[model samples]
Target: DPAGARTLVLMRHAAAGSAVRDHDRPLTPDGVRAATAAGQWLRGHLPAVDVVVCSTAARTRQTLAATGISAQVRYRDELYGGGVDEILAEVAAVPADASTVLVVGHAPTIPATGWELVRQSLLNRDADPSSGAGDELRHFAAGTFAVLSTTGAWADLAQAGAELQLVQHPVA
Candidate 1:
């Protein structure tokens, strides 16, 4: 048991231009628009973000900037090619006082982290027959985000310890 619940949001960077190197790629024009839209939606829905951990990749940085979100951001070079364990380690290091944290990074790992949390959380329940959200999560496109809620402390966050509150994308 924990003192209170916290929310974690995992966002994949928006679309980016093709480049010889992955880290050097910049956001496309549509990516900027999509990031802006996501920022607006988050501004209206999320409480103040206490911490933001993001990749140092050019596209990821551009996506966060485009969102117009104001927060203390930590740029991690390791996150550019990080996997679930790498991200979870970052989450565990967040300050205990922060009630909300955001992670802006790349795909596959981002969605994989979300799924791992949801699957391990106590809140896992049978999927509603009417919804295809799980399927959507499996194949998230760029500019997509997943919101997860959990009662455990950040340091204690483990598999199946969070509820998949919502999943949003800038455009359909």
Candidate 2:
């Protein structure tokens, strides 16, 4: 929470049905509730969100809207199935002045990026003492999010540059 620190919040879109194409699927009713709860949780915990870069997938967009976070949002088609490197590219482009950024996207990529960031932080000895939060990341479910912190510049965020701060799941 230091003024010079940067935080990355990664959220996986909530549940969706299989009736339509994956990109076109809308959030289920349960997904809507979970997303709302997650958003409320964030409101209570975060001071402010400087920006939100999200996948252009319908479910991802609906999830973000349900969160009710009022921030500059960029919907990128590339994010729908982008890998960690692709996601990082978008993150790296953030201006240095923005301290907190939320990336809303899909599963593997979201969890994979979070793990890579923390793994890098651990290797660099920049990781915070384990609060058992790392274990929670292993089962990152829909509507769940991970908060990571780093003292590095947004443009330079790399392996071992960020420490896992917390992982929050929608309250049942």
Candidate 3:
């Protein structure tokens, strides 16, 4: 098993403006509601989040706001379009002692990176475009979330090693 075993939470930004197409567009009315539910779900399950790493996108910030973390949030533009490599880099950068860390961003980046962190091979490189490269940014299902733990370092996490502590998705 891996070591260091810190807690990691991955969250996909709620919903965003539809095809209207704004780069920094904010969350939609329903998006806000969904994100709020996500926040509530997080608060009820995961422990206090020691760090929050998020994309600079407006929807991401809005998601965090709805979560009510109260803790200072760090923004990275790279997080917007970044993939597993970027996420692994950020995870490696975090202090080892931190008990909990949350990474919030858009997908296919989030899902792709998450797949990597869990050490799951992509069944087909182009099979699932919804991972983040498709026309639609999945709901993240509104309040959906996942928790992972590593043995020694975040880099050591594997599909089998990381446990799925919780997953919450708002109903349609």
Candidate 4:
């Protein structure tokens, strides 16, 4: 009914083990455990994911697997190092019928994107950048995710377009 009221989840891949190359490193045992737990937490706390946009990185793939969420997935090689605008493009690509989207990727980019969408909401009537999501997004760590929602269409998402709902570590 209200498809325009959408949810976007931005997550950083869990911990990974050493590999010859960073791209090939898969999630460690603990990372798997954390992701599984995070997945459960996600199911209980957020809207059911209609689609998943994940990086092609080994760790990101493994993280999605560990979560055990059943949804259509788009493994994007571009998302591995995609910038804020790049990831936002992926978000906009989701079919209009989809109401919830989960984006799984690396740090900096994921958190940066989350902050960009939520930053405008921080300004008060006085135009001051106050408390709220600024600190949570700045410290995004492995196995962390932020839940944000937008009243506008995905294609229209812009700075502060989505309000921060919650930021959780899910698992330590």
Q: What is the total number of backbone clashes in candidate 4?
A: 0
Say which prediction, candidate 3 or candidate 4, comes out ahead on lDDT. 4
Instruction: Tally clashing residue pairs in candidate 3.
Output: 11
Candidate 1 least-lDDT 10 residues: 127-136
Candidates in order, TM-scores: namely 0.89, 0.91, 0.76, 0.90
lDDT per residue for candidate 4 within 1-172, as digits (tens), equals 3345788889999999999998899898899988998899989888789999999999999999988889999999879999998898888888867888999998789998888787755542234565566567877879899999887777777643677888888564
Instruction: Give lDDT per model, in order.
Output: 0.85, 0.85, 0.67, 0.84
Q: Please provide, for model 1 over 21-43, each residue's C-alpha lDDT reduced to its tens digit, 9 standing for 90 to 100.
A: 87899999999999989988888
Best by TM-score: 2
lDDT of 4: 0.84
- In the range 1-172, model 2's lDDT, one tens digit per residue, is 3457788999999888775577889999999999999888888898688889999999999999998999988889878999999898898887668878999999899999998887777767744665443566898899899999988778778753688889998663
Error of 1 at 68 (Å): 1.0
Off by over 4 Å in 1: 123-136
- The true-structure Cα RMSD of candidate 4 reads 2.4
Deviation in angstroms for 75 in model 2?
Answer: 1.0
